[PDB]
Amino acid sequence: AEEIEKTRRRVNALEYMTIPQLEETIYYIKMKLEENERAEVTRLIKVKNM
Amino acid sequence: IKEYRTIKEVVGPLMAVEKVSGVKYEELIEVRMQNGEIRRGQVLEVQEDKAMVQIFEGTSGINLKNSSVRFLGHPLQLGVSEDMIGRVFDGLGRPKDNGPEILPEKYLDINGEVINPIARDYPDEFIQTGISAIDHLNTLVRGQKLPVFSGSGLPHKELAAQIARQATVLDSSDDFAVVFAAIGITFEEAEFFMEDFRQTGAIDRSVMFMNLANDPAIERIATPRMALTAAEYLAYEKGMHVLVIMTDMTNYAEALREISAARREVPGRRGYPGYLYTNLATLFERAGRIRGLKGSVTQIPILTMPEDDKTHPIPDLTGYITEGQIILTRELYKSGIQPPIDVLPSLSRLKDKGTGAGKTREDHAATMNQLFAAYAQGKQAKELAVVLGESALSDIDKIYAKFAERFENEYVNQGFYTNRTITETLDLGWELLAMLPRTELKRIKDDLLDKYLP
Amino acid sequence: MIKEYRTIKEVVGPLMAVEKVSGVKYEELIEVRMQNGEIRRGQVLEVQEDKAMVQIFEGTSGINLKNSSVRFLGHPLQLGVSEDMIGRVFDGLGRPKDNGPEILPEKYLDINGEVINPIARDYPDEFIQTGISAIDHLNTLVRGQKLPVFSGSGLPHKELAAQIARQATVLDSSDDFAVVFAAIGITFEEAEFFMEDFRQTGAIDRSVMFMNLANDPAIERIATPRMALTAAEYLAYEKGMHVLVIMTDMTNYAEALREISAARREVPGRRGYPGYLYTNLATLFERAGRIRGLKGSVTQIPILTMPEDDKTHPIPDLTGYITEGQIILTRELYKSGIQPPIDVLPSLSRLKDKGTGAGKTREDHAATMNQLFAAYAQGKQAKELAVVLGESALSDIDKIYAKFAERFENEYVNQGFYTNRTITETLDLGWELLAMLPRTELKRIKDDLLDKYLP
Amino acid sequence: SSGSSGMQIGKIIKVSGPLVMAENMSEASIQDMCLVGDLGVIGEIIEMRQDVASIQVYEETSGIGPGEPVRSTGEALSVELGPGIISQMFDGIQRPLDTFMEVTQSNFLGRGVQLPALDHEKQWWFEATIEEGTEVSAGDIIGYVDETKIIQHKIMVPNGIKGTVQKIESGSFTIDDPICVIETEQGLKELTMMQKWPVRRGRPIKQKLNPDVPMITGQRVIDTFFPVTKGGAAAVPGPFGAGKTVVQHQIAKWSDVDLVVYVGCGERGNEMTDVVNEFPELIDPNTGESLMERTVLIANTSNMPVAAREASIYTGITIAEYFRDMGYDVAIMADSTSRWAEALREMSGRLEEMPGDEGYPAYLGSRLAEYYERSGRVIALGSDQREGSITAISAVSPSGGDISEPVTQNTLRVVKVFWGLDSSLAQKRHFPSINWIQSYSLYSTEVGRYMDQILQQDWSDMVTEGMRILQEEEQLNEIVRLVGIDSLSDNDRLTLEVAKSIREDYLQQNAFDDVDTFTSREKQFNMLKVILTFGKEARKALSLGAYFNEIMEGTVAVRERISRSKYIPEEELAKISSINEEIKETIQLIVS
Ligand SMILES: Nc1ncnc2c1ncn2[C@@H]1O[C@H](COP(=O)(O)OP(=O)(O)O)[C@@H](O)[C@H]1O
Ligand SMILES: [Mg+2]
């Protein structure tokens, strides 16, 4: 019974905190490099047009 | 008139004309191709004896040495008349219903002018759309900018057409028109509207501007301006109450994104133009009503949130402009709720001007706040039920969850062809509040309760 | 002689084009005089043929091109140095702001200065007592060192600087620091903090200050920290004084560079910053240390607010690669009521080796910090696991470290901004906090060293 | 030419958007204002190559092309300062929209219509207060005009003027009529009631002062936990519908300041129309006069010319400085500053400048830093050394709510107050939507001292304890969602219900309720004390051995009274403090 609670805590903590924090982070990380990539591409066109 | 045979160069959709004079910014042009074909265009910038223009149909197939450019001496206009009612036009105001041609009373710049903030008159009047979720909880007001946030596959088409025919103004105004604007939609989507309008006789009350996906991108961004210019004419010069519906606004932004890239303009946040907020505001702020004038312009812009992301530039910047939002959720669409309106993220900011006695009956505002509070608690209790079983619920949490169930299936779910008057809406609301004990209705004073509560 | 031209070709933003000139040099200090009579200083950025591009510090508002002339002073941007500078406060360009008497300047020194010959540069080894334990013991500061503060907007970095500034004294000496303060683009309230604090510690009489506030032109920020470092190397070397250099905000300096860079249409590096940012920053921070034969010293403590609270941002990145370590502040500690909120784990000192040991400190100084590091690294991580999986999910020795890690933050790190801890008190407290662990776990301290100093 | 001489006339050589290039502008300077094209649209010269000037047009350029003339005005972007400015609605470049309407006889904003900001015709009674033959410096007051019954409009000596009063006398004049003759070194100079000033250059002061006096906004969440001082600056970043505008309207309505300058920077037009209607109908009980008689409105809406957004920001702050020099406490609202930055980015791309962060120009932060540095506690110029202040409230509108935005970040590097709005709270109908965790005010420490004195209570410690509970609530809730509330201690569950009381009964504040929209400083003390005393008595009761459920079930009466306490009138505060009596007597029965 005691160990059920420990395991139940771990499952809950893993499902509610760990995993969603991972998913939402990789999205915000993906968006960053998505913007950074094309923010440079525009600059490069300026270099091209010198 | 001015006819010039000298074209310096042609690059992509952009054309350069030399040895020119008396040409202005955003001035309209006509290209006389060597094969006699006439293509329209617009001046993007002009300097000295040179003017840079962009062709709508495109520059494909043009021989420079044997083509000529004529400058019409006026920006992109619209021929306005009272005979526009019942008619169907394209993105540029050109007729499409194959009916008789229209002799315009006059011509107006589709850009229009900005209403003096002093001369503005706060909306302050009720419009009956028929849909209970709107007319009661997220009320539409004369002159309000109230958009619909949808998604792919979601029945925002069915909702728009419903409002288009059902929406009327009480107090028996013999003058109420609907300006329906289609932007970059497929053929069948266009046929859906034009067919439903004719069979419900809503066409006789409406002016339609239909633009397709295969149509030129410039025509796609000029379509809502053609629509609004007609609305401002019908409302401020003919004293009518005009309701403007536009969709899909997402297609407008994608076209605006295409043209921006076509003019070598640097992308803004998430690829969309840095002037997107400003550009959308030049559309949505055309609504409102003016002091000392009979008539008004109300807009209902409908858009599809890309991947249902409300933080996407298109729905986000729209929310920063409009006076509320109607959220459609596929979670309610799967449940078969028609229309699938989630009343929790949905909001109207000027509804208090539309409710109340004289425009509606006296218990509008009270029932609105109560139906929301109980639903939010009911939905929350429902979610707490599912996760913890139906044992963890209180005695009142059960009836509250059961309340929210009928609220979605009976109140919100009315049907895309069911017209509920505001009185029928409010009466139905009380029959749902009766499910709850009187002691729980804290948001309503006892005098109203003694009068309407069953 | 005087050299002046009335031929201004272009005025675009901070940049100005002067043509039909001759005998103009690179980085030459100029003076624009407008049709009204106003004088605005400037610097030559680029000169080709009979043309020359110049940057105007005070800005180009209300300039009439045809009726304005440009004077070429025939020398680079230089500071008028003196011993009278002490007790005075100047602007971003070294001009008096205190209403003090007209200074008879000793020499005129090019603010760019020169690179210290490594052979002449002797190593900094003199431990500095700062009063702050997280600095003194764990991330040591010596004189001649370039040790910056990495902070964020809203974080109390001005307090940490002010604390160090008055609690600064070296052991085995009566040498009192003669600090120099460079204000860069900061606000009035943030400046007045340092200002007022100096007036009631009396250090304003022992210091020279260079003010460039938020209402002051951004282009002046390019020169300001060089005005300070030049005055620093003047007092420290020619006059053999011991100078402490404080510069904030260092972030606002790099912002100014990017403004000119974007104006010159230069090829932009990361985040639009100039490709030569690392070099320009280095020409500031490297201007510190001690030299053979000269008694004086110049020690440097710059302050920068990390944008986005992001350590990997260009400004804190390049600074970290140049300077000899860094002191880092954290919102997590600051919100916890820790004063000062110094996260000791990502912080660093690169001169702590030769800095401390026998003779300057106690011999346990080297073993204590390395033990506290490994213990806090294990303890803090255990605490993370504790708040999510429960305290009863840790082992007995884990809870010992977790309890240690918390007590580490609340007393060792947190000491208050107005409390001065001597190096002895810190070391004594160091053992007390790590005392609550078995000897068998500490594999990083001499066993003969343990017994002697273990409580 | 042709036998006659005239002024220099430029010639348009290029037009693209809000950017017009004009040749033959040799006599013109940078920053100089000019009339562009045949219509004579207002425009500002920003650059210059040879005799060619790059002009920034503050109006629509559709229909303008090369060949058209361009006439300069000589002076830069300036504002008219004097009697006739209060209770007015101006656009970006200070044109009376009231007068704009009547003159053009149109409900719409046309172009090529220049109008004097103030009424040069209207008769004002000037009352001299200075004596003849007095050495007046810049800033010294010579008299006044009671523009409103509430606000006294002081006539100060214009900058760059030093001399001796030769002829001064009271009487009814206009702002064009000479009312004073100042004998200067250059000779004689006539001074009128109206002076002008370039909006881009800040008005001079003697010195700045530390803002140490907190402002009374009437908003419980703000004045208690994240207060703003007079002269301080506060940023309100938040997503749409969070309450940026509502919050700023509340400050405009209830703040203890002399004047309020509201700037409608690139936002909704209805939101400005809502103000010119409602404000003249909002009267505070003491003066007898309305709220509109202390406010100055500047409105450059979203669909209005983008370039004029920047002008609206600089116009309002300069007017705010003008009354600051009169020794008044002014508060300026900017809504929104994001639209200003968006305007800078638009003109930047047109000028083919280079980024910069997120498209914004490299000089964005400077412009922001320059702006907020114009606010603060100052000592106005003059022998009086009078004190005035400007409190700057600015709404930032981050895209998608992400405050990693450059506009939010750069603002936070110069302001000490940050009211962060949470979209989650706004959806929960939790207004004001201020996130009590992330938000902060670096004035709280100093305010606490001022509060402890002016009230004789331990306000600072009450606030500290109040925030301490809210922080535990955040940590406890994390324990809840993965262990369960039933696994919490009774002392922990008490901490939750006390925290709940703080949020719902104190923090939540309806701006549209006639009694809850404002909460006086003394009323805030009683309410917070009642809520805090419930936690203390319950903490003591638990220590005696009482159960959590018993305390909760035996307090339904008082806890409801505590809830409704926010609606208790300002005269009947004795009913609120009396709850402490009912609390201490209720829990002692639970123990027994
Ligand atoms: N303090 C408040 N009290 C009550 N309702 C509020 C409050 N703040 C915001 N709201 C509600 O939220 C909506 C958003 O108001 P607004 O300030 O215009 O949003 P924003 O300016 O952030 O876009 C309003 O219509 C109002 O109903
Ligand atoms: Mg708003």
Side-chain angles (χ1 to χ4, degrees), chain B residues 320 349, chain D residues 241 244-246 267-268 271 335 397:
Chain B
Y320 271 121
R349 300 188 185 187
Chain D
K244 293 186 294 296
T245 306
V246 168
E267 285 283 317
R268 303 179 182 89
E271 293 180 340
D335 188 27
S397 308

Side-chain angles (χ1 to χ4, degrees), chain C residues 8-13 19 35 38 60-67 153-155 158 185-190 192-193 213-218 221 249 251-252 255 258-259 261-262 265-268 271-273 305 307-309 313 331 334-335 387-389, chain D residues 8 25-32 46-51 201 207-211 229 231-233 351-357 361-367 369-370 373 377 403-405 409-410 412-416 437-440 442-443 471 479 482:
Chain C
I8 304 181
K9 183 180 181 181
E10 304 179 351
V11 172
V12 180
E19 67 175 6
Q35 67 288 345
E38 180 177 345
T60 59
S61 292
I63 301 190
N64 183 275
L65 277 71
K66 191 171 60 181
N67 296 285
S153 43
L155 287 179
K158 55 177 181 181
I186 66 180
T187 52
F188 161 78
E189 296 182 84
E190 191 168 357
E192 179 74 1
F193 175 79
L213 308 185
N215 46 24
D216 297 319
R221 305 171 187 172
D249 195 337
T251 298
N252 297 345
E255 305 290 78
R258 189 177 53 171
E259 289 200 11
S261 173
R265 306 289 199 272
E266 299 178 336
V267 177
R271 312 293 181 85
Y273 292 97
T305 53
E308 221 90 325
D309 293 333
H313 181 276
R331 297 188 173 276
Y334 169 68
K335 226 55 182 173
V387 299
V388 289
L389 266 69
Chain D
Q8 180 183 65
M25 302 287 296
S26 315
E27 303 180 0
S29 304
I30 312 296
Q31 312 290 330
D32 269 22
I46 52 180
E47 295 180 354
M48 187 101 66
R49 282 100 173 181
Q50 308 275 46
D51 67 316
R201 189 209 297 180
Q207 59 171 319
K208 264 194 172 187
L209 302 168
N210 295 87
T229 54
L351 287 176
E352 295 162 317
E353 293 176 352
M354 299 204 325
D357 245 332
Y363 47 84
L364 171 62
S366 297
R367 302 294 184 83
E370 288 184 43
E373 194 61 27
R377 270 233 301 176
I403 61 176
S404 68
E405 177 211 34
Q409 286 301 314
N410 293 285
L412 288 181
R413 299 204 305 109
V414 281
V415 308
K416 301 177 64 175
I437 297 295
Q438 299 293 339
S439 306
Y440 67 97
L442 305 182
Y443 286 140
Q471 226 136 10
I479 308 298
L482 69 97

Side-chain angles (χ1 to χ4, degrees), chain D residues 108-134 136-144:
Chain D
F108 302 92
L109 303 177
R111 49 181 182 175
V113 184
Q114 44 183 351
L115 284 176
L118 306 179
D119 199 348
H120 300 341
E121 301 279 356
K122 187 177 178 69
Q123 290 292 330
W124 298 95
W125 178 266
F126 171 70
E127 234 259 287
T129 67
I130 205 62
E131 205 63 34
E132 314 188 30
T134 310
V136 285
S137 181
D140 286 324
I141 311 171
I142 72 176
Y144 63 86

Side-chain angles (χ1 to χ4, degrees), chain D residues 54 77 94 109 123 160 210 275 294 341 363 390 395 442 444 565:
Chain D
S54 308
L77 190 50
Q94 204 192 21
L109 303 177
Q123 290 292 330
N210 295 87
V275 177
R294 81 161 187 177
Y363 47 84
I390 296 182
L442 305 182
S444 297
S565 67

Side-chain angles (χ1 to χ4, degrees), chain C residues 4 40 64 141-142 225 268 275 329 333-334 351 370 390 423 429:
Chain C
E4 170 182 303
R40 298 184 182 181
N64 183 275
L141 174 68
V142 300
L329 301 184
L333 282 309
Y334 169 68
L351 310 187
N370 285 31
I423 180 60
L429 187 65

